[PDB]
């Protein structure tokens, strides 16, 4: 109604061709509700585009306001008129089912009058299309003959499709559905759908009786049969519906797999990165390392955590074995890789690994068969990188955007290292080098930058770092494009002279280190300059700078490379020891730049080692949880130089090694953390709010409701973040509106660089938004619409995380959830399977003294308490009940005193079943392992935890409570004095 497309098209038809796109996007309304005076600030074009945008937006705004004021009534009772869009730019189909039957055969049967017949059987695919088999025959006597296409029309009449959410969190009530399609023109199917029982979730079909429904599907129509399942188990479980048609013989039934995940958000934490050099660090040829247990403070109740320890026989072994392989190469980092620079995972790690293995010659024992695989990986990576190449021989950060000098230099540096491996086109690299030298170099010897910055930048210490980086890039292509590009040595000399001229005024550690490495490559690192390089190191162990974490790692890598270029082997071992330590995220490093720089520095150190050898590590692990001692020996010419061990419990152990080498140890733990807003955000301030959509407007047919998610983020630092990323994890059944994201990205305004809906997202669907920068002065806000397709109750909150790519230390996490609780399935049996947990099978209404005595202190039970409720802290996922201990009938593995306080944590689904109240007395007994605290000493209301509401003393005199007060008192006295007979 409010689109008003006709006059929009009319106005656009009266503008020049180049200005049509500028005005077309000036009329469509963005979801953030921005007046076009503010929107014009985001237009990265000329003043003509800004003027046209502003004029068109004001015109259409006034026009549509008048239309909505005149022809819209709130009491009309007549539906608003809808106009067909009648758009242009229509795109033809481009997705067709993949081809099959890619096999060759030779006819060998005895010919009959020249014709040889061969009978071949094929298995038709499950696509409802019409295949066209194409046959071509080759014979040495007659030649090539092309047969006519053969048409195989696959058809079906009744189709059952089972609609499921991607993943439903445990203890979430979700309505999966089965859609039955009838394709008969004038026939009505009479199907008998049935839901098979599954132990994992209590369907409406109990084990005693299966659930069957007879539904009639109208001709040329479809019917949806909704089902409700609540999952109480984790993993992947099968949902099956069996449908049998009447009088049509069709018995089609569809089975699908549903993934159910714990309530929290899975995280990987590093607890130990200790190096292994017993010859020097150890006491006397023996090293002892004490490994503390992981924190696991915020672990989600009833969720197992797995700890893994990895033994490196070489500081470079893990990255090498990861880079050579394909399915594991993507795990070197923990960040997305969808832009210009981050797309170097395919090329740089594999290139460095291949070069290091070649110059060390470890292929004979590692396996020469893998080299071709690595080459293929590099080829694929190179094929991807050409997507970012502008026609002007320059590489841009994103597709079809301003070319970046820094990225072009990095690409040239990586390409110059791979010509000896794969068939890198010389035209591309030479054109990039020529572009860098001609169009971006100032006469003074400084490389200009015009595109928005990607890394961290009188303009001093900014041009120095960029010039040093570009010089390091050019020194790799010195002998490659020397013939196509002539003035390269002059540019290198000018850049080196400029670097030497202003090298004494540097103050930051990063610029000092990078300029020192550039000079050491050029050979000008001599005299007082060398002293400036050495004195910058703090503790003679690192080129550290306060605040920055990954930049410090990169600068230390540059310094180590410079030291190697200086042919020094005394100041290096401390730097190598420090660099092997800073593995914060997972088992390795976070970003790509720091990872690649450490890889390069360590590989260079290993290459120039004076035949170090002496790799005879023998690591003995004394795990308290295991009676038998664990031992691994890693000698030279071993199989993989990597040894991994796994544990299902959190504990601290000790590591013993006997020397003869320099190994590394890394311990990482995997667990789930409760959905709580991060207490302290290092540098980003984030606020995320989800609200119902003011008007339905355009909604997908399947979507049940639409909501608007609005995110506002700001950078608390002095300068804008170099590059930042929004990782948005979404609740069950929710999908974003792709039209809004496309409008945000592709539009002239370009609020977001690009969006990516495809990731691993093993837990829940994730959306990644690449923000070019975050403004420190004011909040940067963006909003888009998310639609729900499956209705859900007790829905868990979603997470939004904003972090700087090149420095992952500065990240902020927030949680959003739509605004007692209401369920959707309370029936005779469905309300009981959900509530079957957190309680015992007793109904707490007909409790007998004998039954209570028998079930009170069963050998499984290890504690029985009589406490009082202090307060109720109801939360989104787990409720907190702080119980004041009144008297402990018996004591177990946990020590308490009268008057002390404890806290019990209960699942949200059991809030109504518990129905606890303020300032009331209760009696609970439970198992021995029902203690959660390691301090807090929290307890979990499990399946063997009893809850009885102790009547108040003044209310014990009523008819409905005197029958129970005396029984409870007698029971308590009997167990206090007489104890348990059994
Ligand atoms: C956590 O670390 C382990 C051990 O290195 C790894 O297998 C796992 O993939 C990592 N994280 C996740 C979220 O799976």
JSON list of C-alpha atoms and ligand atoms in Angstrom, two decimals, residues 266 268 308 668, ligand 1:
[
{"chain": "A", "resi": 266, "resn": "UNK", "atom": "CA", "xyz": [29.92, -23.62, 24.28]},
{"chain": "A", "resi": 268, "resn": "UNK", "atom": "CA", "xyz": [37.01, -23.20, 24.55]},
{"chain": "A", "resi": 308, "resn": "UNK", "atom": "CA", "xyz": [42.25, -32.07, 25.94]},
{"chain": "A", "resi": 668, "resn": "UNK", "atom": "CA", "xyz": [42.34, -26.56, 26.19]},
{"chain": "B", "resi": 1, "resn": "LIG", "atom": "C1", "xyz": [37.99, -26.86, 21.38]},
{"chain": "B", "resi": 1, "resn": "LIG", "atom": "O1", "xyz": [39.24, -27.51, 21.38]},
{"chain": "B", "resi": 1, "resn": "LIG", "atom": "C2", "xyz": [39.18, -28.86, 20.98]},
{"chain": "B", "resi": 1, "resn": "LIG", "atom": "C3", "xyz": [40.53, -29.50, 21.21]},
{"chain": "B", "resi": 1, "resn": "LIG", "atom": "O2", "xyz": [41.52, -28.81, 20.47]},
{"chain": "B", "resi": 1, "resn": "LIG", "atom": "C4", "xyz": [38.71, -28.93, 19.52]},
{"chain": "B", "resi": 1, "resn": "LIG", "atom": "O3", "xyz": [38.59, -30.26, 19.07]},
{"chain": "B", "resi": 1, "resn": "LIG", "atom": "C5", "xyz": [37.34, -28.29, 19.43]},
{"chain": "B", "resi": 1, "resn": "LIG", "atom": "O4", "xyz": [36.88, -28.24, 18.11]},
{"chain": "B", "resi": 1, "resn": "LIG", "atom": "C6", "xyz": [37.39, -26.86, 19.97]},
{"chain": "B", "resi": 1, "resn": "LIG", "atom": "N1", "xyz": [36.12, -26.17, 20.00]},
{"chain": "B", "resi": 1, "resn": "LIG", "atom": "C7", "xyz": [34.88, -26.51, 19.59]},
{"chain": "B", "resi": 1, "resn": "LIG", "atom": "C8", "xyz": [33.86, -25.42, 19.84]},
{"chain": "B", "resi": 1, "resn": "LIG", "atom": "O5", "xyz": [34.53, -27.56, 19.06]}
]
